[PDB]
């Protein structure tokens, strides 16, 4: 994708004690038009891993089928080995870098989150192949808006609980619905833990709009 066509906006992610949670609005935007309002920009790669993407949704679908076949084969072998989230992070990083080096980039920006070996993983991937791990993540305008809140909270409190993280994520999503124009009220929460991946249905941000009457 030299130029993206149908795009998804910010994806958030934060790791807590015993798992990871990520969130994304169910929207695909065709140049300032909320064309597709019910799409999952969050993926279930395996029991220990979930993926969320921004950017060109078609490229995300391509990654979906590729990575799905990959984990399917890993399951077919039945060898007692499963791809780790960091392994998928590395593979994805190489794929995006290669597509960039051929000047045929996948325009997506991804967020991989997973829990394995009693350790919670959260990593970023950019269309250029930039990759890193952090306790919290945000893509798009979320990097400018939400990531400050997550960073302040995580700095004062290094480790969080599931409920605290969920409340924080919903707060950041409210902020994004306020101050981002390519956003939508409906959003999915996906959380990974010892139990596994659990993706919640469409949720609301519950805006106030008390400011207007002034």
């Amino acid at each position: 994708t030299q130029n993206p066509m149908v795009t998804g906006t910010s994806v958030l992610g934060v790791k807590f004690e015993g798992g990871v949670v990520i969130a994304a609005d169910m929207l695909g935007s065709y140049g300032s038009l909320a064309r597709f309002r019910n799409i999952s920009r969050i993926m279930r790669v395996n029991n220990s891993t979930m993926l969320g993407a921004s950017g060109d949704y078609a490229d995300f679908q391509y990654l979906k089928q590729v990575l799905g076949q990959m984990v399917i084969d890993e399951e077919l072998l039945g060898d007692g080995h499963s791809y780790s989230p960091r392994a998928i992070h590395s593979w994805l990083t190489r794929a995006m870098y290669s597509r960039r080096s051929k000047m045929n980039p996948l325009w997506n920006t991804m967020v991989i989150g997973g829990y394995a070996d009693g350790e919670s993983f959260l990593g970023y991937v950019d269309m250029l192949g930039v990759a890193y791990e952090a306790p919290s993540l945000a893509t798009g305008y979320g990097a400018y808006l939400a990531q400050p809140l997550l960073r302040e909270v995580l700095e004062k409190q290094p480790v969080l609980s599931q409920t605290e993280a969920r409340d924080l994520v919903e707060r950041c999503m409210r902020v994004l619905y306020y101050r981002d124009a390519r956003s939508y009220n409906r959003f999915q929460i996906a959380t990974v833990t010892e139990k596994g991946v659990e993706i919640e249905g469409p949720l609301s941000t519950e805006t106030n709009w008390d400011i207007a009457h002034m």
Binding site: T93, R94, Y97, R100, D126, L128, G129, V130, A131, Y132
Partner: peptide, 8 residues
Amino acid sequence: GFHGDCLT
């Protein structure tokens, strides 16, 4: 510099 190139 460019972190992707650094990684590769």
